[PDB]
Amino acid sequence: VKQTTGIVGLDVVPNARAVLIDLYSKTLKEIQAVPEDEGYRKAVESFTRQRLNVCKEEEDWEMIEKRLGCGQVEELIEEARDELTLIGKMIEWDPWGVPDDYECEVIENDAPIPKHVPQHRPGPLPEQF
Amino acid sequence: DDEEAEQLAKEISKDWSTVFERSMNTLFLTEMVRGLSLTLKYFFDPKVTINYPFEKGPLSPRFRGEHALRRYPTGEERCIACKLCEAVCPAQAITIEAEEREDGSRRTTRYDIDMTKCIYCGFCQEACPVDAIVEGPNFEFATETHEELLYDKEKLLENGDRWETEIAENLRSESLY
Amino acid sequence: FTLNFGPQHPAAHGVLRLVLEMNGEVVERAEPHIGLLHRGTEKLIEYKTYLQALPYFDRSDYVSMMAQEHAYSLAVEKLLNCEVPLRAQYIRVLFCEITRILNHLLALTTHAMDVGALTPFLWAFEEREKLLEFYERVSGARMHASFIRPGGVAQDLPLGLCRDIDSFTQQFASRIDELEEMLTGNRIWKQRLVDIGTVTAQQAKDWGFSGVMLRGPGVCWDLRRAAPYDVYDQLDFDVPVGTRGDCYDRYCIRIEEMRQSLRIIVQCLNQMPSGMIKADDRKLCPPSRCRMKLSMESSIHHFELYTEGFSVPASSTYTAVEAPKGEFGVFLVSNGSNRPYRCKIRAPGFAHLQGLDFMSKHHMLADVVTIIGTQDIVFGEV
Amino acid sequence: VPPNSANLTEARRRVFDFFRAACRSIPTIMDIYNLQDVVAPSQLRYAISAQIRNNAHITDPKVIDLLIFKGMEELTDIVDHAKQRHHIIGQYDFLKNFYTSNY
Amino acid sequence: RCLPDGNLLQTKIHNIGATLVGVDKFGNKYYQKLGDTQYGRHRWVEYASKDRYNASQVPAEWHGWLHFITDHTGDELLSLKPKRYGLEHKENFSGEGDAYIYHSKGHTLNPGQKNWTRYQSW
Amino acid sequence: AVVDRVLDVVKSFPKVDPSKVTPEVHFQNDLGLDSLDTVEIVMAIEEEFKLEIPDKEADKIDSCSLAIEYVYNHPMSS
Amino acid sequence: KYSWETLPKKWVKKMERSEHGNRFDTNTDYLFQLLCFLKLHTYTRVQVLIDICGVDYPSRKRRFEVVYNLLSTRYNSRIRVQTSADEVTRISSVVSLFPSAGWWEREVWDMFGVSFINHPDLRRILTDYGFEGHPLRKDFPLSGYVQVRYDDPEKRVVSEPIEMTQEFRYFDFASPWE
Amino acid sequence: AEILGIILPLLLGVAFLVLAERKVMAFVQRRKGPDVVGSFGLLQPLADGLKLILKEPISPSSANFFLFRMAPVATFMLSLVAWAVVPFDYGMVLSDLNIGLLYLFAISSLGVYGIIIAGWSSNSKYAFLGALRSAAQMVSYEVSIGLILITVLICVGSCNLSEIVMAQKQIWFGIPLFPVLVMFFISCLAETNRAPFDLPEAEAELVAGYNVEYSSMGFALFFLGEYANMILMSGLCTLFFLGGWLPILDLPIFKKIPGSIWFSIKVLFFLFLYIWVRAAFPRYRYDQLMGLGWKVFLPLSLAWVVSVSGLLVTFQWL
Amino acid sequence: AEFVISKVDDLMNWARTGSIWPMTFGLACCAVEMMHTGAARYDLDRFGIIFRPSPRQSDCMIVAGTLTNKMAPALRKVYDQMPEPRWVISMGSCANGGGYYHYSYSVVRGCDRIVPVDIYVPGCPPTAEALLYGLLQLQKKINRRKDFLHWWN
Amino acid sequence: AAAAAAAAAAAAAAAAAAAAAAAA
Amino acid sequence: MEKLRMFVAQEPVVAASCLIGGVGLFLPAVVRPILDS
Amino acid sequence: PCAHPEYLEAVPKATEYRLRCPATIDEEAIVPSSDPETVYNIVYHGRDQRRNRPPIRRYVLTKDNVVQMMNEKKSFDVSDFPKVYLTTVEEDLDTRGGGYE
Ligand SMILES: CCCCCCCCCCCCCCCCCC(=O)O[C@@H](COC(=O)CCCCCCCCCCCCCCC)COP(=O)(O)OCCN
Ligand code: SF4
Ligand code: SF4
Ligand code: SF4
């Protein structure tokens, strides 16, 4: 029923829920190939499970958007497909694990920045609907 | 998709006496005759032009034009050679050499602003402590030859005495800022 | 078949030196050549103090001057932590927005003069010569008003500038309407612009467009709504966002963005607090002429701020404002010294003019000037 | 081009590749910029070889990679009419110094 | 009049309703036609050299009033021009022969070409 | 035929000595040349005989005799 | 920050900051791989290479520092992945991920000399055609080496002789006590 | 002969039309046009001329003097000879041809030669293809002008231009066939280049679009030709459709009704319309332009010949 | 006498000073100020100045903005194809002399290094009237030509 | 040439602001 | 008819030429025989 | 019959505009420099912004620390994820204020 995504190029998908379920099942199945004790797999598993769950529960694309507050289901499909690309890419040139030396210097400068300076404010919470 | 988009964007205007409205606009130019009508209204209206040499565009006392070294009312060049403008200059146009004159009070033996190598940003007017260097609203000093455009050491920037009557006015009105 | 499509009308797009590999009249690839306007700006700024660095920014984009000084100032306050007053912010926006108007008035009707409409150019340039009566009145120079200094703003408005900006804003909706009635309705315009240089949003994101070419495609992304960097979080204005992406949407945006900028000007006028003009931190803001002459401690700062500089602490930030061309950001690495250290200037028109290659593929050779039109390509930033 | 120069051997191989490229491109060089009368192919080969030999003592592989890249840049800007021709024709004891300056 | 060969005719088509506000030493008649219309065109100057005129002949006493920077006619700033160092205008003799044009102190056209060698030779 | 002209182009080479050149001379053994000079002589071969000599084979000509047995076998000899 | 938890620890190798814009000073080998992450990822979606800022630290051992800026139009955040590659280290090119990186990397190579791996059309973009030398380095003098260009008997031609000009006056404003 | 009395005043007309265009198109843009040279820029055309005449050539190249040094002569001679049959008042046509209109059509068909030759002698592939595109445009809006003239001819008895302007004593053909005047004007705009229809005349592509050896005389002669062709093709929208030299016929006491003055007033209206419509409208791109002469002004011209033939055959109005 | 020569020089100079169409090498902002000097307020079509888009037929060439070392050959090639009674105006500090970028490696130290210049409009962003006064000085440079008197030696 | 022609048809003009018109 | 309106909207000048031309192929077809009186 | 709905009557020619030319000081501006609370109280280290900042704390992470952190991160529950910048488009003609701002 969706007329069009305001975004150009992101064509409205009628079968949004079905392809979303497909993509999230593919993602859950493909993420198994990364070691379990990697933050990437915990993240993918968690948010893919949440979105697959909310996509299975709700029926309309509008309710998928309303509960799963992540924009539009077309952009959600873009995100899921890009995530599948990343998991099929991460399998290759596997970066998992930490080499023995692992020198990573976290640097924190806490100087306050003046308020009237570009500061990326958070934006509306998923109570936009 | 563009095929269906066309089909629908043409099935939006598909009711008689709306196809007729759009046909009439294409058949007899309507948007275009509104262009010609506006253009005519401007053909007959007064003209925002300025016959230049006789009347010139509006400026402001903050206007930055030809640099002029100011003087104190009682002669004595205001330019003590601190070199702050030579320092602040972004383009490094001003070359200042200083010498204790025989009177004993410091003064610039060489104060040459290179107008061609100068960005007219007014930093020199701000940086100078005594308002020794200011930009006169002249802005009309196009020179036939480049060497003239390099303003000599304290001799041509000393022509600000002619412009002092306007520079003193602009400073008396801008100093509030 | 290679064609050395240069500047069609000089004095409008100055050093445009495309090398089009054509196919009859259909362009197969457009290879822009940069460097013809490559002044050593990203090197010369490493050699001068943070104050001497500011005049380069009004000379980076020559049709929207103060937006870049405002992007630099916000990059030497991001480091300095230099809180500026409310009046400095309101003036700074009332002039960043007057600059958005000064740019869209040029980048619309210079584009509309490349397309062929000769009169919108001269009407919009009478409007621009009204707004340069504000630039020239508030700072001094009609174009390069080195006015938005790091701490706050150079010097307060004259005592008659808000009245004149109001008397201009009242009569500026009509000028936008004329620029619109003369170009928006025309079938010779739509035909010259509709479905020209259409950029799907994925392309406008990929090629880092981030301007009026990122809101054509429909990506609602304005760094005044995303990253409010002044009173913008207080000022009300709607960011017009296109729905097709064609050069006719970007024109309609630039002609609505020229009205929302009018809203922002009228707000900044109606709510401009009578406060100090520069940050009270006199080690980042040179004291007034009156004070430095009367106070010895102010004189020392006026001396070490117009010769030494700030010496902003060691850091590296990317401050990006919404300049009229797009997201003009100045990545300012700062060694502790008083001179910047690789003040890199991300300038839209370096990312937009990249888009010319894919925007003007399969468009006719006469469209390659329309694309360059709607990209607002100003080669100072490229 | 990725720096496959994990050793001087691959770097030298691609040096010979660039040398063959420049040599087999000398025809267009002589054509576009009209040196087929002032300079002989032997002389242009001589100059390219004297270039590649003048910088032959580079025990560093990546420096050789970058030198070959600068050379390919020069060639590609000579092949096409990007640079002019009056430099291509130019590209091809103590007392006598003391008398002139102090340096 | 008698100049149908210049835009001076546009100025003389002005002055029809304009009032004459002062006239400087050189003869330039400074006019004002306000109230009627066309802001920006309500202050001009009739150069009193109907040929060979150019800009910058307007002295500093009036070059303020005439560019709308101030509202003080040159007959009012003439009581503020400094008597001790005050200098008359010079019309910007750019190109009109040497010794009228300006010259730096090494141009070899300037009488008294100074030598900059900081070392004093022996 | 081809032997005479390959000999002449090795002789006239600006980095050799015409004496040691012989139908048995070697670029590194008897000519004392650098590998760059070998590839240059191969370029001279393929520009004098108009052949398109691949680099993978051009590397393997180390003596004038191999130059002969590679300029003869070209079916596209000029 | 979420991005540091999911990211493989090895990819953010050397450094990581937490203000003035957050950065992941990574290693040149894991760079385009790190740029592959943060893009085409559901919770980190940048998609927009804003800028590629070459920065030259002469006193380092890895002279340059190719500072990739990155905007995330989705989550409204900006991350600055960095690297470090000296004058003769070809660094991975991310024109394949963000096609805007083409001209930015041409400029980084032109100004500095940090050649980019598998970057198609890696050609001097900004400087002159016959330009030798890399300007935005530190050791490159401001006025350039041979960069005066004047007309001459070689008519219709502007030569490129050695340079001579009013000496750029470097002012030593920097004061003690910092 | 008396051909001087029709070429010299036309030369002055073109020279002052360059100024009339600059000045009107400037007044449109809220700015006075050429205004310093003469009393009101009236000497500005003479200044442009006397400048172009005193400009040294870039290269003498008097060798190639039969190829493209007589091709601008040909274009200009055609633009000037199509003025013979144009009648300014009753019995003021220089040569009343009983097939006058068809002669104008032939003069256009030879102006096609003028353009093609003067573009081919310019050994510039871009400029030659531009001249060929301009010729194809000038000749594609000639079938539409042809059919428009067939309409105004059906209304009239004969092709005699003095008759076509004498056949409007009752009503100008601008009033009933106004839709046709709009199509003749929008074609005369496109037949000549000076129009919303001038992509080959896009400011830059025009100068580099007619010749390589300028010498100034070529530049002036092309522009003098374009401005005479414009005075002519505006002196046709005023013979055919407007009453050639006819008043409104109210017969005023204040107005003694001179003929040539009425023809002048109307051709001034159409010249001012040329200027106004150059100012206010964007260019058509030559790819929508050729798709407007075939797909828009040929069907709407064919329909008009069938409409003005039908409505005049049913009711015996012929 | 000589009076006829004086008047024919006055006439030639009046022509070349009335209609002086410049090839406006509008590089950078001084082209935006030049566009304001071509705009409605300060007409340049008033003084006859018609901004030509081609170097082929142009009496002048108002080079503006930063002449880059890469746009130096193009400026020279354009200046070489103007008809001989040509003049050049340098507009803005970057075009007349080294300017803000005098010490930039890529910026020529003033177009006076590529083309011979006849009137340098002063001021880095010259006021539109200042460029207009520079052109009214080029008009003086024409009025001082007397080319016929020199052709008669 | 099979190049995609610029079809001058589209959807009708409807000014599309962002959702932050009244209450962000 | 829906497609007829879709054709007189998308292509106004070939649908108002086959109607400014019908009035010419229709007047002498029927309006002239009507004029027998 | 054009863009003149009694609103273009705001015409460009002003004729009464900058009625007080700028350099005429009818009212002498004041342009405050410092807030009144910071005139006679010039203590700076409290007001300082350049140097009044926490120092950079650059501490190294070794493999032990990051494996500890990876094991500590048990699950990525919602609100451990970056929020989306939600922005939809919505057609509006002149409803904001009624066209009058
Ligand atoms: C209200 C009066 C109008 C007067 C207008 C005067 C203007 C004269 C000066 C020139 C104006 C600008 C010229 C513009 C050129 C382009 C015009 C053009 O071709 O427009 C469209 C066509 O316009 C014309 O052809 C106009 C010509 C009108 C002729 C008559 C039309 C029908 C007449 C009906 C007669 C009714 C009575 C007859 C029977 C009783 C083309 O279609 P499109 O691409 O713009 O959009 C649709 C695409 N499919
Ligand atoms: S305005 Fe003053 S400080 Fe700035 S460059 Fe010019 S002379 Fe130097
Ligand atoms: S002009 Fe000002 S800054 Fe320069 S030396 Fe004189 S007093 Fe000092
Ligand atoms: S001199 Fe100044 S105004 Fe002119 S182009 Fe250069 S920076 Fe711009």
Instruction: Report the number of secondary-structure helices (H) and strands (E) in chain A.
Output: 4, 1
Is I38 a pocket residue for ligand 4 (Cβ < 6 Å)? Answer: no
Is the separation of the CB atoms in B86 and B127 below 8 Å?
no
Contacts of C315 in chain G (CB under 8 A): 20
The structural domain count of chain C equals 1
Q: Which of B170, A6, G35, F32 is nearest to C214 (CA)?
A: A6
Amino acid identity, position I123:
G
Is H196 a pocket residue for ligand 1 (Cβ < 6 Å)? Answer: yes
Is the separation of the CB atoms in H218 and H225 below 8 Å?
no
Decide: helix, strand or coil at residue C273.
Answer: coil
CA dist I84 → I80, I139, I148 (Å) = 9, 17, 15
CB contact under 8 A, H300 and K18: no
Q: Which of H113, H174, H182, H111 is nearest to H144 (CA)?
A: H182
C-alpha–C-alpha distance, residues C316 and G139, integer Å: 21
**DSSP state for residue C158 in the 8-state scheme:** P
Q: Which of B50, H22, E59 is nearest to I132 (CA)?
A: B50
Q: What is the dihedral of CA A30, A36, A38, A42, to 10 degrees?
A: 70
Is the separation of the CB atoms in C106 and C63 below 8 Å?
yes
Residue C302 phi, psi dihedral angles, 5° rounding:
-60, -30
C35 C-alpha vs ligand 4 centroid, how far in Å? 16
Decide: helix, strand or coil at residue L4.
Answer: coil
Q: Which of B136, L12, I91, G100 is nearest to C62 (CA)?
A: I91
> Of F8, F34, F59, F62, which residue is the catalytic one?
F34
Is B115 a pocket residue for ligand 3 (Cβ < 6 Å)? Answer: no
B132 C-alpha vs ligand 3 centroid, how far in Å? 6
CA dist L68 → A38, A106, G166, L62, L79 (Å) = 12, 15, 62, 10, 22
| Chain B nearest CA to H24, separation (Å) | 8
CB contact under 8 A, C354 and G49: no
Is the separation of the CB atoms in H252 and H34 below 8 Å?
no
I92 C-alpha vs ligand 4 centroid, how far in Å? 5
Decide: helix, strand or coil at residue K2.
Answer: helix
Residue of B nearest to K5 (CA): B14
Residue L44 β-bridge partners: none
Q: Which pair of tokens denotes residue C122?
A: 């001269």
Is the separation of the CB atoms in H110 and H78 below 8 Å?
yes
- H or E segment at D50? helix D41-54
Domain holding C99, by residue range, is 2-381
> Going by DSSP bridges, is the β-strand pair I119-121/I89-91 parallel, antiparallel, or unpaired?
parallel
| Chain A nearest CA to C229, separation (Å) | 4
Is I99 a pocket residue for ligand 4 (Cβ < 6 Å)? Answer: yes
Q: What is the dihedral of CA H306, H307, H311, H312, to 10 degrees?
A: -60
Is the separation of the CB atoms in C94 and C272 below 8 Å?
yes
Out of B63, B82, B89, name the one closest to residue C136 (CB).
Answer: B63
Who's near C294: CB < 8 A, 6+ residues apart? Answer: none
Decide: helix, strand or coil at residue D28.
Answer: helix
Please report where in the chains the tokens 């990437």 appear, as a residue. A40
Residue of H nearest to K33 (CA): H314
Residue G82 β-bridge partners: G25
Q: Which of I60, I56, I53 is nearest to I19 (CA)?
A: I60
Q: Is F34 a catalytic residue?
A: yes
Decide: helix, strand or coil at residue G100.
Answer: coil
Is the separation of the CB atoms in B35 and C182 below 8 Å?
yes
Burial status of residue D74 (CB atoms within 10 A of its CB: 0-12, 13-18, 19 or more): middle
Q: Which of F40, F6, F47 is nearest to D45 (CA)?
A: F40
CA C286 from centre of chain: 26
Q: Which of C75, C35, C38 is nearest to C54 (CA)?
A: C75
C-alpha–C-alpha distance, residues C212 and C253, integer Å: 7
| Secondary structure (H, E, C), chain H | CCCHHHHHHHHHHHHHHHHHHHHHHHHHCCCCCCCCCCCCCCCHHHHHHHHHHCCCCCCCCCCCCCCCCCHHHHHHHHHHHCCCCCCCCCCCCCCCCCCHHHHHHHHHHHHHHHHHHHHHCCCCHHHHHHHHHHHHHHHHHHHHHHHHHHHHHHHCCCCCHHHHHHCCCCCCCCCCCHHHHHHHHHHHHHHCCCCCCCCCCCHHHHHCCCCCCCCCHHHHHHHHHHHHHHHHHHCCHHHHHCCCCCCCCCCCCCCCCCHHHHHHHHHHHHHHHHHHHHHCCCCCCCCCCHHHHCCCCCHHHHHHHHHHHHHHHHCCCC
Ligand nearest to the CA of B72: 3
Is the separation of the CB atoms in E51 and E114 below 8 Å?
no
Residue J18 β-bridge partners: L89
Is the separation of the CB atoms in C361 and C196 below 8 Å?
no
Residue of H29, H124, H125, H206 to mutate when probing chain C, most C C-beta within 10 A: H29
Is the separation of the CB atoms in C14 and C354 below 8 Å?
no
C-alpha–C-alpha distance, residues D52 and D74, integer Å: 13
Q: Which of C152, C320, C317 is nearest to C227 (CA)?
A: C320
Q: Which pair of tokens denotes residue F53?
A: 């000599």
CB contact under 8 A, E7 and H36: yes
**DSSP state for residue C333 in the 8-state scheme:** E
> Going by DSSP bridges, is the β-strand pair I89-91/I62-64 parallel, antiparallel, or unpaired?
parallel
Decide: helix, strand or coil at residue G76.
Answer: coil
Is the separation of the CB atoms in H30 and H247 below 8 Å?
no
Residue B92 phi, psi dihedral angles, 5° rounding:
60, 35
Q: At what angle do helices C352-359 and G101-111 cross, to 10 degrees?
A: 130
I129 C-alpha vs ligand 4 centroid, how far in Å? 16
The dihedral built from the CA positions of residue A87, A93, A94 and A99, taken in this order, carries a sign that is negative
Q: Closest residue (by CA) to atom 7 of ligand 4?
A: C59
CB contact under 8 A, H207 and I84: no
Q: Which pair of tokens denotes residue L52?
A: 């009044």
Decide: helix, strand or coil at residue I3.
Answer: helix
C-alpha–C-alpha distance, residues H37 and F23, integer Å: 87
CB contact under 8 A, H50 and I12: yes
C-alpha–C-alpha distance, residues E108 and C70, integer Å: 47
CB contact under 8 A, G142 and I104: yes
C-alpha–C-alpha distance, residues D23 and F55, integer Å: 12
Is I90 a pocket residue for ligand 4 (Cβ < 6 Å)? Answer: no
Residue of I96, I137, I138, I141 to mutate when probing chain E, most E C-beta within 10 A: I137
**DSSP state for residue A31 in the 8-state scheme:** G
Ligand nearest to the CA of B119: 2
Residue B7 touches chain J, beta carbons under 8 Å: no
Q: What residue ranges in chain E does DSSP mark as E strands?
A: 19-23, 29-32, 43-46
* Nearest atom within ligand 3 for CA of residue B111: 5
Write the DSSP assignment of C73-96 as a string of letters.
HTTTTTTTT----HHHHHHHHHHH
Ligand nearest to the CA of B114: 2
CA F62 from centre of chain: 8
C-alpha–C-alpha distance, residues J18 and J10, integer Å: 21
CA dist H175 → H241, H243, H313 (Å) = 8, 10, 19
- H or E segment at G116? strand G116-117
| Chain F nearest CA to D75, separation (Å) | 18
> Going by DSSP bridges, is the β-strand pair E29-32/E19-23 parallel, antiparallel, or unpaired?
antiparallel
I64 C-alpha vs ligand 4 centroid, how far in Å? 7
| Residues ending a continuous segment of chain B before a break (C–N > 2.5 Å) | none
CB contact under 8 A, D77 and G90: no
Report how this structure was experimentally obtained: cryo-EM
Amino acid identity, position H45:
P
Is the separation of the CB atoms in C326 and C215 below 8 Å?
no
Residue of C nearest to J15 (CA): C240
| Chain I nearest CA to E56, separation (Å) | 9
Q: Which pair of tokens denotes residue A78?
A: 């873009």
Please report where in the chains the tokens 């937490």 appear, as a residue. G18
Q: Closest residue (by CA) to atom 3 of ligand 2?
A: B89
Q: Which of C351, C265, C358, C380 is nearest to C14 (CA)?
A: C380
Cα C226–Cα C229–Cα C234 angle in degrees, nearest 5: 85
Q: Where are the alpha helices (DSSP H) in C110-246?
A: 111-115, 119-138, 161-169, 172-181, 187-193, 201-206
Residue I109 phi, psi dihedral angles, 5° rounding:
-80, 65
* Nearest atom within ligand 3 for CA of residue B128: 2
Q: Which pair of tokens denotes residue H90?
A: 């009753």
C-alpha–C-alpha distance, residues C37 and G92, integer Å: 29
Decide: helix, strand or coil at residue B150.
Answer: strand
Out of C9, C122, C186, name the one closest to residue H30 (CB).
Answer: C122
Q: Which of G6, G5, G22, G23 is nearest to G14 (CA)?
A: G23
Q: In what order do the strands lie in the sheet with E29-32?
A: E19-23, E29-32, E43-46
The dihedral built from the CA positions of residue L12, L13, L17 and L21, taken in this order, carries a sign that is positive
Resolution (Å units):
3.7
Out of B27, B29, B36, name the one closest to residue H276 (CB).
Answer: B36
Ligand nearest to the CA of B40: 1
C-alpha–C-alpha distance, residues H278 and H198, integer Å: 10
Q: Which of I40, B32, L2 is nearest to H277 (CA)?
A: B32
Q: Which pair of tokens denotes residue E9?
A: 């005719």
Is the separation of the CB atoms in D48 and D54 below 8 Å?
no
- H or E segment at C316? strand C315-322
C-alpha–C-alpha distance, residues E36 and H114, integer Å: 54
C-alpha–C-alpha distance, residues H241 and H178, integer Å: 8
Is I93 a pocket residue for ligand 4 (Cβ < 6 Å)? Answer: yes
Contacts of C241 in chain J (CB under 8 A): 16-18
Task: Say how many residues make up chain D.
Answer: 103
Task: Say how many residues make up chain I.
Answer: 153
C-alpha–C-alpha distance, residues C21 and C30, integer Å: 6
Is the separation of the CB atoms in C145 and C155 below 8 Å?
no
Q: Which pair of tokens denotes residue I132?
A: 């207009």
For chain F, domain boundaries: 1-78
Residue B9 touches chain J, beta carbons under 8 Å: yes
Amino acid identity, position C225:
R
C-alpha–C-alpha distance, residues C74 and A116, integer Å: 8
C-alpha–C-alpha distance, residues H205 and G53, integer Å: 39
Residue J19 touches chain A, beta carbons under 8 Å: yes
| Secondary structure (H, E, C), A61-107 | HHHHHHHCCCCCHHHHHHHHHHHHHHHHHHCCCCCCCCCCCCCEEEE
C-alpha–C-alpha distance, residues C350 and L23, integer Å: 42
H70: left (phi over 0), alpha (psi -120 to 50) or beta: alpha
Please report where in the chains the tokens 């599309």 appear, as a residue. J16
CB contact under 8 A, C55 and B123: yes
B94 C-alpha vs ligand 2 centroid, how far in Å? 7
* Nearest atom within ligand 1 for CA of residue H292: 19
CB contact under 8 A, B14 and K12: no
CA dist G6 → G9, G41, G97, L69, L73 (Å) = 8, 10, 20, 11, 10
Cα L94–Cα L100–Cα L101 angle in degrees, nearest 5: 110
Q: At what angle do helices A73-90 and A16-30 cross, to 10 degrees?
A: 20
Residue C111 phi, psi dihedral angles, 5° rounding:
-60, -45
Residues 66-95 of A with CB under 8 A from C: none
Domain at C248, CATH number:
1.10.645.10
CB contact under 8 A, C307 and G173: yes
Is the separation of the CB atoms in H216 and I82 below 8 Å?
no
The structural domain count of chain D equals 1
C-alpha–C-alpha distance, residues H310 and H298, integer Å: 18
Residue G69 phi, psi dihedral angles, 5° rounding:
-80, 160
